[PDB]
């Protein structure tokens, strides 16, 4: 049945009824109910009742949402109890949507559920909802989630959003794309790096070293690259780089030899 009162926590319940003025009257109740070592289903009720009065209190929400995650932790993440936790974060965010920790905890819970398709969507909401100055807390989770999985097409689109606010991460984007065999996209981003005239990147590479990594990448992968006139860029290195002309003529031939275009290899 839906009704039932103890003999032992009635003073805390009656105290709240006469003193509806502070969270402390509920905290004394909630703190008491835990010392009893009481059932989790009763704790959810007292928290949701307290959060009906004090719906903007971050403390009770953060404690309640973490208490749900605590007692459900022994259940498999496929279980519907983890789905019910996410629906509780939605109700929390309907007040505390400007608090980053709730968004971060919501996103971590979606990762623990292992779903992908709308975990990305929860992240997209967090970016729209939080101040831009808070977004670095989100992006390091958002990218970390995506780069933990074999999700090349999604991660590409999310990264070129991310690099509009943190362009210094483009070096790490290149390293991701190479590991995911996105060689043509990796070479596109390297050219974007080489088109920046800063003397060195945050990974300690100068423009000549970044351009050498492009010539490396572009000559040794003839079959995998399509957007770049590989011959044109390497001849743009025989131009200007007068101290390595003999190397770059062989590097251009090496590209054609790996393409098995031996006729044009002899032309070079």
């Amino acid at each position: 049945t839906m009704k039932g009162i103890s003999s032992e926590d009635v003073p805390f319940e009656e105290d709240i009824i006469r003193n509806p003025t502070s969270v402390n009257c509920w905290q004394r109740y909630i703190d008491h109910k835990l010392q009893n070592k009481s059932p989790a289903k009763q704790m959810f009720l007292i928290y949701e009742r307290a959060l009906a009065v004090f719906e903007r209190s971050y403390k009770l929400w953060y404690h309640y949402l973490k208490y749900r995650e605590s007692t459900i932790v022994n259940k498999c993440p496929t279980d519907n109890s983890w789905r019910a936790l996410c629906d509780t974060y939605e109700r929390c965010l309907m007040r505390l949507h400007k608090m980053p920790r709730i968004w971060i905890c919501y996103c971590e819970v979606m990762i623990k559920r292992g779903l992908i398709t709308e975990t990305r969507r929860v992240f997209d909401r967090a970016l729209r909802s939080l101040p831009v100055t808070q977004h670095m807390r989100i992006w390091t989770l958002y990218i970390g989630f995506l780069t933990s999985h074999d999700l090349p097409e999604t991660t590409i689109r999310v990264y070129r959003r991310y690099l509009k606010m943190n362009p210094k991460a483009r070096e790490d984007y290149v390293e991701y794309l190479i590991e995911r065999d996105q060689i043509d996209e990796a070479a596109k981003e390297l050219t974007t790096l080489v088109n920046q005239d800063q003397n060195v990147s945050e990974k300690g590479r100068t423009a000549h070293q970044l351009w050498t990594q492009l010539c490396d990448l572009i000559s040794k992968n003839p079959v995998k690259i399509f957007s770049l006139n590989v011959d044109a860029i390497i001849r743009q290195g025989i131009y200007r780089y007068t101290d390595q002309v003999g190397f770059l003529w062989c590097s251009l031939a090496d590209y054609y030899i790996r393409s098995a275009e031996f006729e044009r290899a002899r032309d070079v």
């Binding site: 003999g246 190397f247 062989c250 031939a253 090496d254 030899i257 790996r258 098995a260 031996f262």
Partner: peptide
């Protein structure tokens, strides 16, 4: 670079001619 450029165009032949043989068979 004298040793770099020769030996790295030697494997380039190896990777290249291994692929050439695959192409010459698939044409059949």
């Amino acid at each position: 670079r004298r040793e770099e450029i020769i030996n790295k165009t030697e494997d380039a032949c190896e990777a290249g001619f291994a692929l050439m043989l695959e192409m010459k068979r698939n044409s059949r």
